[PDB]
């Protein structure tokens, strides 16, 4: 029914991204490619993973199928898979997932998809500011901010993009102008977010990876990571802090 072959890097990316918010997830094998979305139990953050069929070395499906996966077990297993190694995912029967790489075959019981928490709805967000930067830089900014507060402000206007954190005795400001950013629409936006979710999000990205920020005023933020040289897309949506 399902027989795909991907790189270790690709599989390790999808699993890590998801495991950040949920333990179990529905994985969709569409004509288009791999797709998986989840909302953490808090309903504060959402993750959207998209691996287009082109990215796969092999991508064979008979029909579009959905499977219930234990992400904690797949994640734990993917640590044994090398970055440059090739991994084969196979679904013959409707109860077990086969994961092949090297001389190792791993079999795991699938979860009844109806047993997993209802698949989330992709929110319709109208967001003025659009920021494109290096995910690595962003990661360093969040880490710096983390030493000051539990929360940061994402500020945007004609001057540029800012990440700011305030403590009782100190503060930190990350600032980049249109010149320094890869792409910037100079949109006006100001929202506040929890540093803890942001750190967790950044775990799936590094220097060289592209990050697209969709920002509004007291609205959720869209953090679109383009990883594995544009072969995988990991989007995180985070609800803001108000009042």
């Amino acid at each position: 029914m399902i027989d795909v072959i991907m790189t270790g890097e690709l599989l390790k990316t999808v699993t890590r991204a998801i495991v950040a918010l949920v333990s179990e997830a529905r994985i969709h094998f569409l004509e288009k490619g791999l797709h998986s979305r989840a909302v953490d139990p808090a309903n504060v953050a959402m993750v959207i993973v998209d691996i287009p069929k082109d990215s796969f070395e092999v991508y064979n499906i008979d029909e579009e199928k959905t499977i219930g996966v234990d992400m904690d077990r797949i994640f734990d297993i993917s640590k044994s898979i090398s970055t440059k190694d090739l991994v084969e995912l196979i679904v013959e029967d409707e109860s077990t997932l086969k994961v092949k790489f090297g001389s190792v075959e791993y079999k795991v019981a699938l979860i009844d998809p109806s047993a997993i928490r209802k698949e989330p709805r992709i929110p319709e967000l109208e967001l003025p500011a659009k920021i494109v930067m290096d995910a690595g830089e962003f990661k360093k900014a969040i880490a710096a901010a983390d030493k000051i507060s539990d929360q940061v402000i994402f500020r945007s206007d004609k001057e540029g993009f800012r990440i700011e954190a305030k403590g009782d005795v100190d503060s930190i400001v990350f600032h980049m102008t249109e010149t320094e950013l890869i792409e910037f629409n100079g949109g006006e936006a100001r929202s506040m977010f929890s540093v803890d979710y942001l750190k967790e999000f950044c775990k799936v990205a590094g220097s060289g990876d592209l990050l697209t920020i969709h920002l509004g005023t007291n609205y959720p933020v869209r953090l679109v990571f383009e990883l594995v040289g544009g072969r995988a897309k990991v989007e995180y949506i985070l609800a803001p802090r108000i009042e």
């Binding site: 504060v44 953050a45 506040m192 929890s194 803890d196 959720p220 609800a239 802090r241 108000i242």
Partner: protein, 202 residues
């Protein structure tokens, strides 16, 4: 050389006590065997079982500082200083040959030196010691289980307020309504100064 591990639970809480626990074992190898190192991933049920296994083979010492007493002590001291005082108390109860402590602070080496002076015993304080020394990991399990117990006693009086951490949405909800009511229970610590929204609000 009879060694001991010291850790805490609830230092970052809004509701509930600060729990400091110490564990000293005659057989460290038997303790590693229990799987204390990677216990964070365990369920509430499995953590409770693991704590009982620790208690069977080790001497355990627990100290609890109430929110009221923390608020009182924090007038003149920082959380870390209070934590250092608690660490020394536990070390002195156990009197080990060497004590391994998990340090929150930037320079754990200075904490080692201050504690060695207070206790007169050899002390090793390290960043993330709970994932290096089985003794500290065990201490962490005990402290978490005791705090969860203390929270349970509080839920008996003041209903389900969740975990007691600002990160728990249930805690934020309950705290918000308690604040609004003007009737805040004693279990809520001082320094409770934004509203976290959900994706459904959009």
């Amino acid at each position: 050389l009879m060694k001991a591990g010291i850790d805490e639970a609830g230092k970052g809480c809004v509701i509930g006590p600060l729990v400091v626990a110490g564990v000293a074992c005659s057989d460290e190898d038997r303790l590693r065997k229990l799987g204390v190192k990677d216990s964070k991933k365990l369920s509430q049920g499995r953590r409770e079982e693991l704590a009982e296994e620790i208690r069977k083979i080790c001497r355990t010492e627990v100290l609890k500082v109430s929110p009221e007493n923390l608020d009182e002590r924090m007038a003149a001291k920082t959380i870390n200083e209070i934590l250092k005082e608690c660490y020394a108390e536990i070390i002195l109860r156990l009197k080990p040959e060497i004590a391994y402590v998990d340090s929150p602070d930037v320079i754990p080496e200075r904490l080692s030196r201050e504690l060695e002076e207070i206790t007169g015993l050899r002390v090793v304080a390290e960043h993330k010691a709970d994932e290096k020394y089985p003794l500290v990991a065990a201490a962490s399990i005990i402290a978490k289980v005791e705090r969860e117990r203390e929270i349970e006693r509080l839920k008996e009086k003041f209903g389900d307020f969740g975990s007691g951490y600002a990160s728990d949405p249930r805690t934020r909800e309950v705290l918000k309504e308690w604040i609004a009511s003007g009737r805040i229970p004693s279990c809520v610590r001082m320094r409770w100064k934004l509203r976290q929204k959900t994706l459904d609000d959009f």
